[PDB]
């Protein structure tokens, strides 16, 4: 547990165990010749062939696959298949807000591309929390965003209420407001082709790749003011990006002309292969020990441990519609965080690191001389629709007044 | 601007609630460029990069407990 | 132009000149086409992002961020798919009406054949062609 | 009588088993791969997007789309006593 000194090779030093990657799932605390470790709060600790795990209190993961013309969840525990939306087209990218609204319903965000002359679109439906199928069926809503073509790319920001979504086609990275409301482009020159973006609002901080004809990996300020490249070698068509925020706020990204998923810090310095013949990987996600990843040529999702240790399983064969994997899950994104902002800004607040920064739509300025007021016109929220939520199996049908209402299966009752 | 309010450099003011609180208000950041420290016993020392409070004797004790500075050859 | 494709197997899209236009396709068009209301390039890419876009100096833009010649703005006929170039601009006799009394009037302010009430389409862009009033 | 279905010409045509009379009974068929008969309908496949589509077996009216299933499926088969 000691090493020389070099200041003095007669004597002898701690080793920080914790700098070892992959030495614990969660989290690592040094000691003068020693090391402990443990999972931080929502997460326990269990024995197992390898050591410890880390396993998460709530009810357990689930996974989000888009295909081409419907979602479809699946359940890691129950190893079984749940129908949510349906009669769509041309599904490409997904992602979630857990409790927006206090109720027992996530909602969830999705992203259409362009069939035609017809634009593209992003929707925004309703996630029963608990249990359920074709009983509760789901309407839809569009946040209004026009002129999208080919909006591959899709992040939520659960802190500041906003929506972060890159397009291949016209080449921008661009923000709104969770309900479509103010628009503002981020990042506007030199992007060939934005394929995949993330979001770390703890750090402030925002993330994306480029499969043009100079691929990278960069990072910015989530207000757009400054940026860097994290990585520009060796990185073929890199298409998917997943952040852990558990092991340090940590980067991973898969490419399919390499068939490799690599992991970064989100400084940049210090990376690693964790997987290699991924077999065309397209999407990734990161939950517990666990990595999930999407192969694109065949319709598999396959798990592996996120250190890059073991073998690797195949968990599902989904046609090769499917885009991505989605996992969902209480902990997977810390909802405790709180907003800086402090209610200054007239039209959006985006986050920065430390702090906030106050923004106007496209095409508006700042009122001469003030750096928190735009010159632009106020937009009440678009609330959405009440979802159906029977619990139980319960069946829903609207009424007269349009208002869903349930019917109890034999062993239940309630309202809901 | 006036009236016991805190001032930003970029001619802007805020109220002195805001001034040393966790979060940047200021653009030019200096409501918070400057702040004293919050300490621990004085039987111990205390490190910023990490938040974290070790015993004084560990400042030098051949151990580098705080990553960025603050222990060892700099305070030996 | 020979029946062999010899002149364009081997092809690479070429670059656009200072007046053109590139659509996703890699297909260069007149700069003109961009925001006129017509999918010049088959993924409709000519009438992306128009709102935020300023107009050429001949031409007046619609609310829709859409351009039409300035010489067709106030003239009577809904040349904006939104109407906007006719809505908004003064009043034209001293009746106070927008319209002849040989045509008709629709709250768009624009001007429409008098025959053209109440059949099929509406011919005024919402101007309540069509009510069973007129009918 | 024998149907078929052609995708290089997105066609479903029928003949009689001696071949005396040839008929087209869907054009843009939308590259048809598999084809089954049952009482009025005919339902076929369509290999780029995955759909089961009917129309009437005579080529009379108006096609429907009947399913939505994704592009690795080859065929479509009709189940039932009668059928045989
Ligand atoms: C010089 C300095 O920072 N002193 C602080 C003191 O103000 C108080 O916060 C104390 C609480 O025990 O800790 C230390
Ligand atoms: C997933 O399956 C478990 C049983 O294995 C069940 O308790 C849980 O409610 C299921 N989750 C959902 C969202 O249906
Ligand atoms: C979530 O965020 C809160 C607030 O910053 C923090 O106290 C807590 O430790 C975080 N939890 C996890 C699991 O990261
Ligand atoms: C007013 O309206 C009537 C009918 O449209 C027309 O005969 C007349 O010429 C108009 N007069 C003026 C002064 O505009
Ligand atoms: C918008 O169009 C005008 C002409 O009306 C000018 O060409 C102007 O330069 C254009 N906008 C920009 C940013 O150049
Ligand atoms: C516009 O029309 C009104 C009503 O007919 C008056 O005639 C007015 O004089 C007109 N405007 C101008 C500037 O002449
Ligand atoms: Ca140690
Ligand atoms: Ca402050
Ligand atoms: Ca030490
Ligand atoms: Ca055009
Ligand atoms: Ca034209
Ligand atoms: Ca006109
Ligand atoms: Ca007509
Ligand atoms: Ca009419």
């Known amino acids: 547990g000691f090493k020389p000194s070099t200041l003095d090779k007669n004597s002898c030093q701690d080793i920080n165990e914790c700098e070892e990657f992959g030495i614990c799932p969660q989290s690592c605390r040094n000691s003068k010749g020693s090391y402990e470790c443990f999972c931080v709060d929502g997460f326990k600790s269990m024995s197992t062939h390898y050591g410890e795990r880390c396993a998460a209190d709530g009810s357990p993961p689930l996974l989000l696959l888009p295909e081409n013309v419907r979602i479809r969840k699946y359940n890691i525990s129950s190893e079984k298949f749940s129908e949510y939306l349906e009669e769509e087209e041309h599904i490409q990218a997904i992602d979630y807000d857990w409790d927006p609204e206090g109720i027992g319903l996530s909602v969830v965000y999705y992203t259409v591309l362009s069939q035609g002359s017809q634009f593209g679109a992003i929707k925004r439906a309703y996630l029963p929390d608990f249990e359920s199928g074709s009983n509760n069926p789901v309407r839809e809503v569009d946040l209004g965003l026009k002129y999208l073509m080919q909006p591959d790319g899709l992040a939520v920001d659960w802190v500041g209420r906003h929506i972060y979504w890159s397009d291949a086609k016209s080449q921008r990275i661009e923000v709104a407001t969770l309900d479509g409301r103010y628009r503002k482009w981020l990042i506007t020159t030199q992007l060939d082709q934005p394929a995949a973006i993330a979001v770390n609002p703890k750090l402030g901080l925002m993330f994306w790749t480029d499969q043009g004809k100079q691929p990278k990996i960069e990072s910015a300020w989530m207000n757009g003011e400054h940026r860097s490249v994290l990585a520009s070698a060796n990185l073929g068509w890199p298409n998917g990006l997943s952040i852990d925020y558990l092991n340090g706020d940590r980067i991973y990204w898969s490419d399919s002309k390499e068939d490799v998923i690599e992991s970064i810090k989100y400084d940049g310095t210090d990376r690693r292969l964790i997987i290699n013949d991924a077999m065309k990987p397209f999407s990734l996600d990161i939950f517990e020990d666990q990595l999930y990843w999407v192969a694109k040529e065949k319709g598999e999702v396959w798990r592996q441990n996120k250190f890059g240790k073991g073998n690797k399983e195949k968990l599902l064969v989904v046609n090769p519609w499917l885009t991505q994997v989605r996992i969902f899950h209480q902990l997977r994104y810390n909802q405790s965080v709180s907003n800086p902002c402090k209610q200054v800004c007239s039209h959006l607040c985006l986050l920065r690191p430390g702090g906030y920064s106050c923004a106007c739509p496209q095409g508006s300025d700042f009122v001469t001389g003030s750096t928190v007021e735009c010159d632009a016109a106020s937009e009440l929220p678009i609330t959405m629709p009440s979802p159906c939520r029977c619990m139980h199996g319960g069946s829903c049908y609207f009424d007269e007044n349009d208002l869903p209402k349930c019917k109890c299966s034999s062993g239940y009752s309630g309202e809901y | 601007c006036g009236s016991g309010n805190f001032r930003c450099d970029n001619g802007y003011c805020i109220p002195a609630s805001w001034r040393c609180d966790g979060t940047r208000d200021c653009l030019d950041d200096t409501d918070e460029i400057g702040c004293p420290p919050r300490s621990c016993g004085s039987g111990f020392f205390l490190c910023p990069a990490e938040g974290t409070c070790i015993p004084s004797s560990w400042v030098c004790d051949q151990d580098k407990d705080c990553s960025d500075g603050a222990d060892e050859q700099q305070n030996c | ?135």
């Open chain 3, 1 to 135: 132009d020979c029946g062999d494709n010899s002149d364009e197997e081997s092809c690479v899209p070429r670059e656009c000149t200072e007046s053109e236009f590139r659509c996703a396709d890699q297909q260069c068009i007149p700069s003109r086409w961009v925001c006129d209301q017509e999918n010049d390039c088959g993924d409709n890419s000519d009438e992306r992002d128009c709102e935020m876009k300023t107009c050429h100096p001949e031409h007046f833009q619609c609310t829709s961020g859409h351009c039409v010649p300035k010489a067709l703005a106030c003239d009577g006929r809904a040349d904006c798919l939104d109407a906007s170039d006719e809505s908004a601009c003064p009043t034209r006799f001293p009746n106070g009406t927008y319209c002849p009394a040989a045509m008709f009037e629709c709250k768009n302010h624009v001007c429409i054949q008098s025959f053209w009430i109440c059949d099929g389409e509406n011919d005024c862009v919402d101007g309540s062609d069509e009510e069973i009033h007129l009918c």
